[PDB]
Amino acid sequence: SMARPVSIGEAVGIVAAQSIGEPGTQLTITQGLPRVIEL
Amino acid sequence: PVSLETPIGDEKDSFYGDFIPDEHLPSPVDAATQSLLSEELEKALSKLSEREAMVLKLRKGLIDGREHTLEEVGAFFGVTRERIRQIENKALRKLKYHESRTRKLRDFLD
Amino acid sequence: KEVRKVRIALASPEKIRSWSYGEVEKPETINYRTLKPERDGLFDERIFGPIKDYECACGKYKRQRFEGKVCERCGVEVTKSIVRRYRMGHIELATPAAHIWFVK
Amino acid sequence: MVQVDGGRFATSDLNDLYRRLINRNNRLKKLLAQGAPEIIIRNEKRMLQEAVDALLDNGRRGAPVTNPGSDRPLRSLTDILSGKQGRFRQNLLGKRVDYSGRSVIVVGPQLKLHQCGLPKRMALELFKPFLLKKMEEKGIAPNVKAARRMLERQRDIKDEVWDALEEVIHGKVVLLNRAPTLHRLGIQAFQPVLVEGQSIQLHPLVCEAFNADFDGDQMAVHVPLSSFAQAEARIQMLSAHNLLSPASGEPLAKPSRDIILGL
Amino acid sequence: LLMGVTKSALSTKSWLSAASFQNTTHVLTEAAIAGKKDELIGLKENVILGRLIPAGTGSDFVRFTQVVDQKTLKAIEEARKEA
Amino acid sequence: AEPGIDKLFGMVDSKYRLTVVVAKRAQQLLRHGFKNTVLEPEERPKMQTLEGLFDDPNAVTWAMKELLTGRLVFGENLVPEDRLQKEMERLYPV
Amino acid sequence: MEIKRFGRIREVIPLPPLTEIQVESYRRALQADVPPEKRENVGIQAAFRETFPIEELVLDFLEYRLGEPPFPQDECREKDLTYQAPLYARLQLIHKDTGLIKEDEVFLGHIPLMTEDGSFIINGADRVIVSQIHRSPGVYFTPDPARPGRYIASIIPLPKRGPWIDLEVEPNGVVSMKVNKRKFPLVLLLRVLGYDQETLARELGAYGELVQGLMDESVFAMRPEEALIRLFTLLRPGDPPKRDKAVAYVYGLIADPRRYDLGEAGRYKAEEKLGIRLSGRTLARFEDGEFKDEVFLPTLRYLFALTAGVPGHEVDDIDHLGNRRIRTVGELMTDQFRVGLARLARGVRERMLMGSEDSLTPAKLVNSRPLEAAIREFFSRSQLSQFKDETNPLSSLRHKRRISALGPGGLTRERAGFDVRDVHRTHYGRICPVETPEGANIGLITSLAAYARVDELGFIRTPYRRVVGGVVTDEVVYMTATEEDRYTIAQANTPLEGNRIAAERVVARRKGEPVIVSPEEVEFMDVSPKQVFSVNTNLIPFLEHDDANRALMGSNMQTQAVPLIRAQAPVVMTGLEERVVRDSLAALYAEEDGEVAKVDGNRIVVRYEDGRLVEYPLRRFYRSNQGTALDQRPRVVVGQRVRKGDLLADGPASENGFLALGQNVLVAIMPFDGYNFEDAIVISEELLKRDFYTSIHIERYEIEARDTKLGPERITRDIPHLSEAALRDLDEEGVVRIGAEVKPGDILVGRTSFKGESEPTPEERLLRSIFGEKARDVKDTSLRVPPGEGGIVVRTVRLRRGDPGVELKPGVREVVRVYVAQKRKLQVGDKLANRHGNKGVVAKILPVEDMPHLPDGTPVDVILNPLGVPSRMNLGQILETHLGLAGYFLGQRYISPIFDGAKEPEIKELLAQAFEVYFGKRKGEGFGVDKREVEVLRRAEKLGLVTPGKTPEEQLKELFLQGKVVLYDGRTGEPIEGPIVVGQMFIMKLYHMVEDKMHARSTGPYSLITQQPLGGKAQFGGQRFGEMEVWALEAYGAAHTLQEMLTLKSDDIEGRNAAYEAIIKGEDVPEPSVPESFRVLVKELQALALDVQTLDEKDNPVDIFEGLASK
Amino acid sequence: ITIGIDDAVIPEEKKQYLEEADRKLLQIEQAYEMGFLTDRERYDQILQLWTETTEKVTQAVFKNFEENYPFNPLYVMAQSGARGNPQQIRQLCGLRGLMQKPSGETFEVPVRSSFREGLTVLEYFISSHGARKGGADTALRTADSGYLTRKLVDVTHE
Amino acid sequence: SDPVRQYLHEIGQV
RNA sequence: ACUCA
DNA sequence: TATAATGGAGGGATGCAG
DNA sequence: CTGCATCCCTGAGTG
Ligand SMILES: [Mg+2]
Ligand SMILES: [Zn+2]
C-alpha cells in the first residue's frame, strides 16, 4: 500500500486473508471459487 | 412469565431479551451527575468553617453514612446540644446564602 | 498484577463446592406476591448476594458502614449488588452424573 | 428474571432447565429415603442424567427438551457459547459500540480526499460530552448538567452550540465504515465537515474501496476517543494516506466514471 | 504434513482462538483435559480478552518508545550528571 | 493528506513508531497545557473562529508539527519514566 | 388531454379478478353463503366430516353455521380486534347402546373473515396470507443418482398427511420399500395386502428379470396374518406384536383416511400417471376384515416397466408446473382448522370416559380451546401470515398475488439449490420470470402471472386461444402445464388479417421449445404478451428494451412508491394503470347509473336509477401499516350524471382512476459537476416549490397507565418539576391538544409513576436540607417525541377502565394513542426511481437559476447521469424520455402496451409534430436562430448528428427527432457543447427516506446479560462493530481504537463511566478495563464445569472479579 | 455526453451476418436430414456457428463505432473505461446472443434482437432462465466467500 | 434411546 | 421471516 | 382416604466410529 | 460403505 519496506508490527496475516477474500464474490470453462476452496 | 429467548422474526438472528434495557445499573450520565453533585457539595461546604461544615457532614450522613443526632454531634464537639443545633442552623444559613448568590446547586434539584 | 496467560482445566467437585456460596435446594424462583426471591431458590439473596447495593433483604443494615456483615435476621451479606453476576451456586446430586461433553 | 416495560416477566431458559434438574434431584432423594424399588430408582436416575445433559448441552443426546406448548428447544449453556449467535462471535470477537451512528450516504464532489460530510445533529450526538465540556468552557451553560438538559430539548438549542461543536471537532477525524467490510479499506478515517441535512457526504475516489454507490447505501460513523486512537486514525487509517491496494500494490483511489469520461 | 485451513486453524496452540473459530465443544474438552494455557500470542486471544493486540501500535517493537523535548531532556541529563 | 506525512514516515523505521511518538507527545501537550511546546509563537497551529485566530486545540496536529521541526528527541530507554514525569512536572507544573 | 394508444394486438379477454386467488379460495373454504344442506365436502365442511363421528357414546356432526361479525372492519382496526365471524356446530351425542340422542348447537369460537380486497384484520393489523408453492402429491419416478440404469418410485401425500414411501430395486435384486427411514422387502407388504405368487407372476412377469427378485418363498409360505405380525415387528421393534395392535398401526400408516391423505390433486395425479382409478385418497383399504391394495401394485408395475425400458413410461420433472401446485389461503387455513379439530376430538374422546357415563351433553363434551388456539396461531404467528404491505395500493395488490416456496411444510433456505430457484419453461404464462426478490430469496419468492389463475386442484393455468385450420377463434381454454405440453402454441404477435393467420411461417412453442411452424400445425395461440409477466412487470413501458435484471428492480420498486399529494399517472402508460386501481379497491366507483346528490370532503351521496339514496363515506388521512397516508378525494361535483362503474373518488396514489405512483418531470440526461456521480440524482428546487414529491406520513404513538404494587400509574397534566413551557400544549387530562406542533423532546402524553422505594443518598439528604423541598412521591414517565420525529397532532384516542365498551388487558387502567402526521418534502438522501430499474438518491437540490434550461427559458427538473444506462442495458427509459418530450410539447399522454407498443418511426413522427410547436412558435414570435444554437449545430455536425448544408431549423429538427435539444447552462449562459437528451420521465419517490434512517448515539440503553448497547434506531441503539470491522481495525494496526471499541465504547462498565466523566470534565479518556462479556463467558464456562483461570507471568491466578466471586 | 436511443447504432453488417448464418443453418439442416451427422454434431455445429456470428457482429459494432462515430457515447464510455464493456455494447447494438436452458444446455435458436430493437416475449422468457441462474449463483456464492474469508482470517491472524 | 419405552419394558418384566 | 446495501 | 380401574420427509462437504 | 455431527457473508430497517 506504500510501495516501500513494510513496517515492523504490521498485522500481515489479516491483510493476506482480506486480500484473498475480498475478490471472492467475483470468481466465476472455469472452476472458480469452488476450485479456490478445494485448494 | 415468558422466555427471554423468544424469537423475533422468523430468522434465528434475534431474541426478545435483546430489546429489554437494564434499568438497575446506573447509566454513565447518572454516575457522572452523582459525582458532580458530590464535588459541588464539597465546594459549597468548603465555604463554611471546618467545624460548621463538619456538623452538617455528621448530621446528614455524608461521613460514616449515619445521620448523627444533635446530642451526638454536640458531645463530639464538646458543646451543648443547643450550641450544636445553633451552629448547624447558622451553617445552613450560610449555605443558603451562598446558594442564592452562586446558583450552583439548583440544577441538581431535578 | 497483569494477565499474561489463560488456563482452562477440569473442575473437581471440591473446586465446584469452593466456588459455590450455597446450595440451591429448591426449584422456586421468586415469591408470587412479594416478587422477592424465594429462600433456597435459584435467586436466593443469601446465596448469590443482595439485590440492592449495601442493603440486606429485610432492611436492617442499609449502608456501606456495614460491608462484609451478614445480617442475622435475613442472612444476606451487605455488598455491591454486582456480585449477583459473579457468585456461583451448586446442586448436590444424589447420584453422580456424567458430563455429556466427555461422553458424546 | 426481569420485569419488562408493561410489568410482565421475562426469564432465561437456564432457569427452567435448572428447575427440571432440581425437581428430579429432590424426587430422587425422597424416593431413596422411602425405599423405592430399583425400577423406580433407575428411572429417576436416568431422568436425572437426561436433565443434566439438557442443562449442559440440550439436543446433544435425544430429543431436545422444550417449554410447554412450544417446539422451541430451550437454550442451554453450550448453545450460549457456540454458534454465530454464541458468546464468542456475538459478544467477544465483535460488539455493538457507543459513540457510533449511521446514515444514508451522498456523493460529495467538493470534498477533499481526507474529508467527509457529516450531518450536524449526528455530530452533536457523537461528540456530545466534548460538546458539554466546550459549552461549559464558553458561557453557554453554567455546568455540564445544565448543558445536557439544554441539549435534551431540540427547541432549546441555540446557534452558539453549533459554533462550539465546530470548535470541538477541530482537527479530529471520524471512521466511516460500509458493510460488508471485505478488506481493511472498508473502514477509513476522514476529517468531518459539518453539513446541514441528514446525509453523510462521501468522497468519490473512495467509493471503489468501499464498493459504495448512491442507490441507497448507508454507512456507519465511529468516533475514536483517545489521543492514541485519534493519532492511529489520522496517521494509519486516513483515506489520503492509503492510496494503493495492499493486495496488488496498484492504485485503489484512482479516477473512475465521470472523471475518466471528462479527461 | 499438509492440512487445510480449517484443520490447521483448529489445531493451533491457542485454545481461545480455536474455540472461537469452530467446534467449540471438541476444542474446549481437549483443552480442559490437557490443562492447556493460552499464551495470548495471536490477535483473537487479546481481542477476546479486551487487550491491546500485539500488532501496530501494540507491537513490543514500537510500544515503549518515549518522547521528550530538548529542554526537559537536557534538564534530566544535568540532574543525572549531578548524582 | 497530513502535511509532511512523507517526511514524518522518513523519520522512523516503522510507521507505527511515528504513531506512538505523535500520540505520546500529544498526551504530554494536553497534560502540561501546551506550555511545554517546542514551537515558537509564529509556529503555533491556528484555528479560525468567529472571533478570529486562536490556538489549535488539537494536540495531535501540534505534535506532528513539533516533530516536523526536529526539536523533539524520540527513542527507547532515554530516561526512567518516574524521573521524566517529575522533571516535566517541575519544569511545567499542573 | 388526449390519450394516444399504440399496438395492434386485440386481447379477446380482459384481465381476471386480480385478487381472486385469495377471494375465491377463502370463499370456497368457508362456504358461508351456501345453505348447510347444499355444501360440498370441501374446506371447513371437509374438516368437520373428517374429524367426526367421534367413536370412543358416539358424537356425530350435523352441520355448521357462521354468524355475522360482532364489529365492522374499521372498528376492528380501531380497537385491536380480529375481524371474524362466530362459528357454531350442531352436534348430536348418541348412545348406541341406549339409543338416547341429545342434540345441541355448540359454539366453537370465531374464525377470521377475509375483507373485500383479500386481506385480513388480525389484532387490529392488516395481514395477508401468501400462497405457498410445493410439490404436488402423487406418484413420481425419478432416476436413481447412484445406479444409472435404475430408478426410485416416490409416493408423496399432502404435507403432514402421511409418510413418503420409496420403492427401490436394490443391487441384490429384491425390491425394497422405505418408510419412516426404515427399509424392508416390499414383498412382505404385498403379502399383507393378500397377493399370492400366482398373481404377481402373471401380473409383472412381462418384465423379465425383476419378478424373480420379487419372489421370496418364506413370505409366500405364511398367510397375510403372519406377514402382518412380521411387518409390525419390522416397523415397531420392542413393541409386543399383538395382532390388533399390528392391524391398527398398519391401517393408520397406509389405509387410514384420517392419518393418511393423498391430495385430491394427489389422487388425480396418481390416477393419471398409473392409469388406474382410486376409490379414495389412501394407498390401500381395510375391507371385510382384511387389507386390499390400491396404489402399490400399479406403482411397482410402472417402476418395473420403466426400468425395463417399456415405451410409454417416463420419468417425472419435479419442477414442472404440472407437478408443482399452489396451496392458497383456504387450504392452509383449513389445514390448521383440521389440526385444531383433531385436538378437540382427542379432548372429546377423553371426556367420554371420565365423569358420569350417562348424563352428558355435546356442550359438556366439547372444549373449543384447541381449535381457537390453532386458528389464532395460524393467523398470528405463521410465516405465511405477513404484515400487509399497503405502502400504495399496488403494494397490497402484489402482496396478495405472492407465491412462496418457504414457510411450514416447505423449503428451508439451505434446502433450496439451483433447481428450485430456476425459471422453468412451464412458468410461461403462470409465474412471472422477472419479479422476484434480489438476494437470498431469489427464485423462492415469485409472483403470479397477470392472466393466470389457480384451479381447484392447485395448479396454475394460463389461457390460450383455439386455432382451427388457419382461423383463430375467440374461445379461450385455461390449461395446466401438463395439458399445455400437448399442443403447438403460436405467439400472440403472429400477423392476422381478420381471424385468419396471415403469415406463411409462424413462431410457436412445443413443450416450451420454440419452433417455426405452418399455420395448419397451429393448435393454440397466446392471448397476449401480458400473460407472461406479473402485474408489476406489466406496468413497465418499453419492457422489451430493458434488460431483465433491471426490469426486476423496476417491478420490485413500484411496490415501494410513496403516495404523493400531487401524484399523477405517467405520460407513457402500458394500459394497466386503470385496472390496477380498480381491482385494488382504493378508488371509489358508482354502483349503477344515477346523479350525484352531494359532494363533500368526507362523503359522497348518490341518487341512483332505483331512487335509493346511497351515501359513501370517504377514508380521510388514515395511516397504513407503513405510515403512508391512505385518503380518498372526491372526483365528482354536485348534480353530475354518472353511469355504472364511473369514478366517484380517487384513492391514494391514483389520478382520475389511473395508477399514480410518482410524478412526470422534465429530465435531462447529462453529467453535472459530479453531483450525479454513481447513480446519484440532481433535482430542481422548483420541485419543492410546487410541492412535487411531497408526501403525507402519520406515525402512531401509544402509552399505557397500569396498576403497580407501588401505586397506580396516572395520565395527568401534573408532572413533577416541569415548567409551563413544557406543559403548554397539554389539555387538562395530560394529552397533547389536536393541532399542536410537536418536536423531539416534547411531551405527547403526561404520565406519573410511583417512585420505587429507595433510600436517598447522604448527598440527597444534604441537598434536600439545603433547599428544604420534599422529594415527590411520583416520577415523570411521560411519553415524549423520539429524536428525529414529530409533526402535527391530528388524532388522540383514550381508553380508560370502567367506561362503556372497553376492557384492557389485566392490570392496565388506561391506554392513550396519539397520531402525529407530517408533510415530507423531498430532500437530500431521499430515494427516487423509475419503472426501468434506474434508482438513485438525491444528492443536490440546485436553485432554478443553476438548472440547465431550454432556449425558451424552461428549466429542467431532474438531471440523470448517462453513465447509468450502458452497463445496465435498460433502454426503456430512453424511449420513455423521447415519447415524453413529444407528449410534453403536444400536451398528450400515451399508452404503449408491453411488447406491442410505440416503435421508433411513430415516435419520430410525434417528435416532428412536437418540434413544430417547439420552434414555429418561436419563429412566429419574431425570433431567429441563436448564436449559441449555431455553435452547437456546428459541434453537432462535427459529431455526425445533423447533415451538413441544411438550414439551422432543419438541423435542429434533425436533432429533435433524435430526442436531443440545445441546452443552456444556467450558471454561464453558454450552451452545453453538444445536443442533450431531454424529455418527460415518470419518477417515483420510494419509501426509503433519510428522515427515517438517520440515527446517532453517544451513550444509551445496554443489554441485560452482555451489558452491550442495544440495537436499532427505535431502541436508541449503537452500531454493531462486527468481526469484519475488527478485522479492518486490526489490519490498520489501530490497537487503541480497537480496544476502545471492545471496552470504553461498550460493556466495560467502569471504563465507559470513567470515559464519559473524563470527557465531560475535559480530561483524557482513562485506561480500559475487563469487558463484562468476558466475565460472562468465564461464568458460563464455570456453569459447564470448566475452570477458566486468568494467570499472570508467574502462572499465579489473577482475579478479574476483584474478590466479589470468591469466599 | 448523453444517451439517446439512436446512440445504440445497429451496424449494416448485422443483416448480412444473419442471412449468412441462416443459409449456413439451412445447409447444416440439409446435411442432417440426409444422415451425414448426428443430432449431437448438428447441435454442436449450430452452437459454434452462432458463437462465431456473435463475435463477428461484436467486431462489426466496434469497427463501425471506431471508423464512423469515434465520439459516440457508448463507444467513448467503453473505450475510456468509464462504463460498459464490449459484450454489453453488443447486447445493446448487435444481437443478444445465445441463451441457456435451466439445465445449462444452450438453446438452438439465439436471441436475434438487441435491446435497442426490443426482444420478443419468447426471447425474454428464454433469457430469464440465465438471469435467474446468475442471481442464484451470486446469492449462494457470497456465503461461501465469506466462510472462506473467515477461515483464512482464523488461520493467519497471529 | 426412548426413556418411556425403556421404562415400559422394565415395567413389563414384573 | 419480509425489505435494503 | 376403599366398587373397580394395571404398557404412550427438496444440500452438501468432511470428519469420526462400526 | 453407513450413520451422526458440524459450519455454511455483513450491517441495517420493521414488527
Ligand atoms: Mg449500491
Ligand atoms: Zn437483613
Coordinates of N, CA and C and ligand atoms in Angstrom, one line a residue, chain C residues 55-61 70-78, ligand 2:
Chain C
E55 N -27.2 -3.3 51.0 CA -28.5 -3.4 51.7 C -29.0 -4.8 51.8
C56 N -29.3 -5.3 53.0 CA -29.7 -6.7 53.2 C -31.2 -6.8 52.8
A57 N -31.7 -8.0 52.8 CA -33.0 -8.3 52.3 C -34.1 -7.6 53.2
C58 N -34.1 -7.9 54.5 CA -35.1 -7.4 55.4 C -35.0 -5.9 55.7
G59 N -33.8 -5.4 55.4 CA -33.6 -3.9 55.6 C -33.1 -3.5 56.9
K60 N -32.4 -4.4 57.6 CA -31.8 -4.0 58.9 C -30.5 -3.2 58.8
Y61 N -29.7 -3.6 57.8 CA -28.4 -2.9 57.5 C -28.5 -2.4 56.1
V70 N -23.0 -10.0 57.7 CA -24.1 -10.9 57.2 C -25.2 -10.7 58.2
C71 N -26.3 -10.2 57.7 CA -27.5 -9.9 58.6 C -28.0 -11.2 59.3
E72 N -28.1 -11.1 60.6 CA -28.5 -12.2 61.4 C -30.0 -12.6 61.1
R73 N -30.8 -11.6 60.8 CA -32.2 -11.9 60.6 C -32.5 -12.5 59.3
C74 N -32.1 -11.9 58.2 CA -32.4 -12.4 56.8 C -31.2 -13.2 56.2
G75 N -30.0 -13.1 56.7 CA -28.9 -13.9 56.2 C -28.2 -13.4 54.9
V76 N -28.3 -12.2 54.6 CA -27.7 -11.6 53.4 C -26.5 -10.8 53.7
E77 N -25.5 -10.9 52.9 CA -24.3 -10.1 53.1 C -24.5 -8.7 52.5
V78 N -24.0 -7.7 53.1 CA -24.1 -6.3 52.6 C -22.9 -6.0 51.8
Ligands
ZN2 ZN -31.4 -8.3 57.0

